[model samples]
Structure formats: structure tokens, C-alpha cells
Target: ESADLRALAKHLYDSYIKSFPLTKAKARAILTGTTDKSPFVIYDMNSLMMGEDKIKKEVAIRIFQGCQFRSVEAVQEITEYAKSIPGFVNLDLNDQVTLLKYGVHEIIYTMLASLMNKDGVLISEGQGFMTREFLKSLRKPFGDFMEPKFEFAVKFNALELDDSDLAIFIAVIILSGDRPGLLNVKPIEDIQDNLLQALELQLKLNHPESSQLFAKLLQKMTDLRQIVTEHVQLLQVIKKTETDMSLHPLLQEIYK
Candidate 1:
């Protein structure tokens, strides 16, 4: 049964990759700011570094806004991807939302790393790219949130899995039965098991000499969860203190 499921899972992944051959390409375009050239700046780089508390708060708020925008964009892609899965559309809407809410942040981080090229993530939709060094120089609490993501990204990139691997990997993360309030966990678990089997097979086939790579990638998911926990905590703080910058309703929903 497991082998049969793995076969099904592998076939699904191939179909997804064929339809979404640009998943990785699209991710890079979005991260690198090549897709949309609209003007978006979180804060003036010059003033942000030297600005007063007010300016700093504004910067922080805008940064939150940009991240929220990116998060929304990511959710849309993930939702579309999820719908493409064979049985996913049959799930209850509430259950679907619940699952997406639980995992979107993790999926976003995974895509974020896909574009990561030793430098920091591209910000403001490609208007600017922040380096690890510059991010570390930011003020307290703000810098705290961004640093962990980059740290995780660097380590994840070391695994060197290609786009095909990531598509299956993210599908596993999103369809997890561990998500709270799931209505039909058994099916989700079964699907995830199949995906896991497929992922293991792919890792072996793709990196025959890198036997430990599969385990390392699994470990990265735990690390991503920790980083996202911190990211949400920072947003909570921003909500309470940074009243000047409004949190998008969608983002508020995610944070809740």
C-alpha cells in the first residue's frame, strides 16, 4: 500500500511540476523583484539607520506591511497549488483554511530561501535587497525577527534541493495532519505519508552520496517552525505598540 501510494505521489509531483514548471522561476522572480516593478519602500535606508524613534517605528510598520503583502501573495500561490492536489478540493472549506493558516508562514519561508543567494531576502518587491549585515544593524526587536529567518535560509540552502524537490516538500508541510482543528486527519496523514515516501525516494535519487541530506531537510522544518513562532510574536508586539502602522486584515487573520 505504501509503495502504491508513493507511486501515486510521485506521479502527482510530476504533474504539478509540469503544470508549474515556473514555481521556482516564479519564486525567484517575486523574491528578486523582477515580477512587479511597483515602487515600494519600507523605509528610507538613509533615515532608517539614523532616524529617531518615530521614524524607526514607521520603518518597522512599513516593514511589517511589506512582509504581510509578501505573505498574502505567497498564500495565494500555495492555495492554488493545494487545489491542484487530487483530493484537496474535496476537503471542507473551514478545514482547508485551518490547514493553510497553520502552514502558510512555513511555506513562505521555504520559498524565501529558494531565492536566497547567500545575500538576504529581496524586500519591497525587488525595490531593494537587504543583506545579512544590514539586517543585523537594525534596531532591537526588529532585527530580532528578520535575523532568524535568514539564519534558517542559509542552512536550508546548504541542502541544495532543486525546485522539483521543494514543490513536494512544501506540499508535505501544508498537508500535515498535525494542524489543529483538522476535520479529516486520517486522509491528510495518509497523503503526507505518501509525500514523505516520495520525498525520501527523490532525495536518494537526486543526491546518492548525500545520505544525511534527507534527515537534515526534515530537521529544517522544525527550525522553520521556531523562526515563524518568533516572527508572529514580533508581529504581536507590533500590533500592541506600533499603532501608527495598520496591520492588514489578512495578516491579522494569519497572526491570530
Candidate 2:
């Protein structure tokens, strides 16, 4: 983590691309490790672009922008800005795929922030264009990233799970595992039962610190999903407490 070197690398990118913006050829050149005169320059550029700090910060902005895009006016404004870019504005299918591969992780981080924000919502119909397949892929991998962090926090706090912990566990399982709506899916009728068990275990230890990071991660989740959904509906889900057993009884039961 050479702070000085990183600063220099970002400065280089800023200076080089200031007037040009990002073109398809240039973007590919930068990513393929062949840009500029020196290989070290290209390598350093990649490192800075791919660095965790840059990824998280950019992703956070993406998440915020996405959340805003749920409104019609916001969507129009964002689309206007997106259209100003040459290759990016009216991107073809292949271009979209390439962008996702390059920027998906950052997008996921932004979504996590939305999920943690209690008032946030995402209205994606889980349909075509914004398809279920894409959501499923993102959900599983992102949840996995948060999983170890959750366990580590739990251990460090020397605490057990409470109702909040129980809600989070159920949320993770729902996000990461195949349960309701799969080919051989378990019945949603009994999901409450499982969540109750998990909640009880968490309550026994009552660890508080285990939740901080999970909560933070969830904030971004809601932010990302709202981009495609654009209905302000997903925010409702995020804002609601987990105590309502009627909609999600088993999960809500844990809070009781």
C-alpha cells in the first residue's frame, strides 16, 4: 500500500484521460496491460484502478446514483449524463457485459450499502434486462463475502445472537441459499421455524458487534437493487422492521 505511489498513479490517470474521457479502445488498452510507453505504468494503472479503496468508493457513488435513479426525474438526469459518453451512452449488449465484468464488484458494494439503509428500497421486477439470473449471481457471491466477516465479528465480540442477529441470519440464508422457489425448494411455510431457531441461538449469546458490519453491508445492497427496480418499492422492504410476522412470520418471530 504505497500511498505516495497510489496518489501518483491516480494523478497519471486523471491527467491522461482528462480531455478524452474513456473511449472503448482506451478502456480496453488500459485493462489489457498494454497502455502507455512503460509496462510499469500500465501495471500501476491497473493496480490503482483495481485497488480496494477505489472500488469501494466508486461503487458507493454508483450505489447512491442508482438509488436516486428510482425516481423518474433522476433516471432521466442520469441517462442524460450516461448518454454524453461516446461508447458508454448507447452501449450494446457486449459492451454492457464487459462493463459488468469490470465493475460488478463495485456495484455489489454499492448495493450492500443500500440494503443496510433502513429507508432504502429497490423496485427491480427481478425480470428481463434486469433479470433474476444476474441478481442470483450477485446475491450469492456478495453474501459469501459478508459471511466470513459476520462470523469473525461474532467471534470477536464473544457474544451470542439476539433478535437482530436472528433476522440477519435469516436474511443471509435467503440471499445465499436455495430455499423457497427452487426446483426442490423447501416450503416457505416453515422458513419462520428455521429463522426462529437461528434467532434463539443468537439471542443466547446476544452479541452486538457482530451486527455492525452486516448492517453496513446491507445498506449498499438496497442501493444497488433500487437501480434496476426503479419503483421505490425496494426501499420499503429495507425500511421495514423484521418484526412483522405476517409478511415474513418466521423471520419476524425471532425479533419477538
Candidate 3:
């Protein structure tokens, strides 16, 4: 192996993925504080939302704002995670910010699965499960973006990646050499190449029954890039027309 699996995985987990919740239960607990595990009724609102032509104004005011807060929190966490990668801080400062600017939406999109299942994502401090269809009702610019991410999340969670694998995988995303206007590329590329070797091996070793999954995951990155592109354009539209909506100040630069 080009990278030592035992050491790299252990190091990556300790440095970065350590704070991330590893199980769906734990992920919910981080937001929900792990107090109750009792079963409760899941209300199916399908028949209700069916007659609605679009995401109602109430949803625009409450739910979308709710998500913006989460997105901001997500970018903050992801930024910290990015800086911890072994070779990341050695890069030009401009390149470092640029990488995070370009990579974070993709990183956050990928990480959403931890807080999500197929039907809904954990939101409102994990007190609420927002259904996929409800999010899809955002319509046009928003609908097009949210649906693909949940689709990706549902499929991604099927892989059952553990903490170590996720650490290296996210690290690779942030270290991309191709992020536009990178001051220099080779070092970023070099680090990503090494992490890829480690990540590939981690997947194969963890899922010996399905070595092809690594390839499947690589394909998701391509799909996710398209998702992020759609997100950027949609945000631009929202910024133009949706005066009531707002994004985090930190995000303004990334999506700028």
C-alpha cells in the first residue's frame, strides 16, 4: 500500500473525524442530546402537501431559514476539519481559503447522510425530521438542488462508512488541486493522491465483499460536483430575488 492504513486511519480519525457522530443514533443525539430513544409516531404529511402548489410562504420563512442556520454551522465545522488535514496549512493562504470555498458545499452535502435517512433529515436541533418531499417542494431553483442531495444521501448511507473512512474521504475533497484559482496545485494534488490511496484501501479493507464500492464512491464525487454547481446558481438567484432569505456572512464569500 502506498499509504500505511493502520497509522493513517488512526491519525485521521483522531485529528478530524473524532468529533463527528458515527451512528445515526449518535448523530441525532449530538443535536438532540441523547435523552430519549422511545418510539414515536411519524406523521405522514403526504396527503396534506399534495394540494399545495409550491412551498408555502410559511415554509419559506421558517424552514428555509432553519436550514440556513444549519448550513452556516456546517461550514464552520467543515472549515475546522479542513485545516486539520496534514498538509493543508502549508499551502498558500489564498489557496487554503479557496479550497474551503469550493469544497465545503460538497463536503456538507456528503456529510448530510449522518443526519439523514431517506425520508427526512434531522433538523430543528434534531427535534424535527423534515421529509424529502417537503424539501422538494421548494420548487424550481431550490427543489432541483435539495432533491439530488437527499438522493445521494440515501444511497450514500447504504455504504455504512465508519468514522475513519469518512475522515480520509472528506480530507480528500478539501485537498483538491482543481479548485479554481488555486495559487499552486501540485502540493494539494500530492496530498489528495496520498489520501486517495489510503481511502481506497480503507474501503476495500473495510468492505472486502465489495471492492467495487470505491469506484461507485468516486462516481458520486462527479455527481456531487454537479449538485454543488446547481446550488451555486440557485443561491445566486435567491440572492437576487428573495429579499427575505439570508445566508451566513461566511457563506456569502464562498457563494459570491
Candidate 4:
């Protein structure tokens, strides 16, 4: 049976709504100086940086909890988008779990582009913007937890992708067959092949001027893999140094 790849890609993007309610395009707009009133800022009070700390640990702890909750919700939304793809929904249970276990963080990082600008990113369901400086302070003190994500988000935002492009690219990431320990790989690869095709086609229309966009995006995927690896590696330090920080089960299990 022939699949309508456009429709498939579009819905996957549409499925992204819960994770990104107002649309990433709009998020960028809000971050600009268009509005006189500034949005809420989620400060990392755990910072031991050069600057004096204004936020208290109590407020910071609340930020952590709220951020974790949103992360779990993002996982739920990502899983929904994954299952929406054909073949993926029927993959053996363990195989399905494995894909998410590896890819969810990657998706989260990529999705973060819509939430960030040069200096900070929007967090806590987009209600507040988290500055890069404070997060840097907390990374070591929490430690590199979000540094790479910030680095990648800055570059990714330059790509200028709309919801459709972001959705299909995320699908390809989740559906990738390259992840380890899959009980079944053939079907997943087949699905990935089609998703890539869909992504390429969508890119052609979305970015007709840039001939190398498709290649650039695929490279971004490679870069994201490295970020997740660094993310996991940094955890060894974080796990031992910081004992008070807590994470959602989905985040904890995925890293493990």
C-alpha cells in the first residue's frame, strides 16, 4: 500500500502540539523585544558562579520539579508521535521501549530550539525563560547537564525549521534503527527509510534555497547523538557529586 507521506509528516508535526502549545514559531516571536513586559524567568539558584545569587534554593527546587514534570509530559507526547508512525506502533514491546530509551533525550534537545534564543531558553511549559548563565552555574553545582544542550540549541535555532520539518525530523530520530539491542530491526529500518524520504521531500519545499539543508540536518542528528552521549557521561559526575537532585522515572530510565 502506498502511504501519503505528506499527511503522515503533517500529523506527526501536529502531534507535537501538546509538547509545544503556542507553536515554536510564536515562542521565537515572544522572545523578541516585541512586548514591553518580560515573561517569567526560571532562575537556577543553585548557582555558585561569580555573580551574586538572587534566587533561593526553595524557588530553584520548585523549578526543578516543574521542569521534571514537563519532561515526563514531553516523553508522553513523543511516544504518542512515535506510535503514530506506521510499523513503529507494532514493534515488539522491548524494541519499542529501547527506541525511546535512547532517542527521547535526543528529541528533547532538538525540540528545545524552539524554546531558546542566544542567551536563554523557555522552560516550565514556556511560562518562563531560563538564562544560559544561571544554568551554567547550576550545571556543575547540579554540573555540564545543560551546557551541550545550550550549545546545540543555538546552532539548531539557526536552521529555522517550522513545525512540519521539526516533526518529521523527530520521527526519523525516534524511528532510527541504529540504536542498540533491538529485538526486531528490519521493520523499524524500513519505517525510518520512509520517514527520511518524507523529511527530504518536506525539506525541499520548506527550504528550496538551501541545497545542503538535508545533509546539514542529518549531520545535526549525528551531533545530537554525541550530545546525548556527553549527557549520559556527565551524569557519572552529577550522580556522585550532587545527591539532592531528583529526576522523573522516564528521564532516569532513559539515561540508564
Top TM-score prediction, candidate number = 4
Per residue, candidate 4 scores C-alpha lDDT tens digits across 13-36 of 767664556567777777885654
What is the TM-score of each predicted model, taking all chains together? 0.79, 0.20, 0.82, 0.85
State the lDDT of candidate 3 residue by residue for 1-256, as single tens digits: 5447667777887866444534444664554444463222223445334323222255444456667887887787788877778889999999999999989888888878777777666654444456676677764556655777777887888877766677888888898899889989998899998888888888888889985988888787897788888777777787777777667787787876
Each model's C-alpha lDDT?
Answer: 0.70, 0.31, 0.72, 0.75
- lDDT of model 1, residue 256: 73
Candidate 1 residue 35 C-alpha distance from true site, Å: 17
lDDT: the better of candidates 1 and 4: 4
Query: What TM-score should be assigned to candidate 4?
Result: 0.85
Total residue pair clashes for candidate 3: 0
Where in model 3 is the C-alpha error above 4 Å? Answer: 1-3, 21-25, 28-35, 38-57, 137-145
Tell me the tens digit of each residue's lDDT in model 1 across 91-194.
87887898889888898888787655556655533445556665566666566767777788788878877776787788888888988789888878877877
Per-candidate Cα RMSD to the true structure, in Å, reads 5.5, 21.7, 5.2, 4.1
Off by over 4 Å in 2: 1-186, 208-256
Supply the global lDDT for candidate 4: 0.75
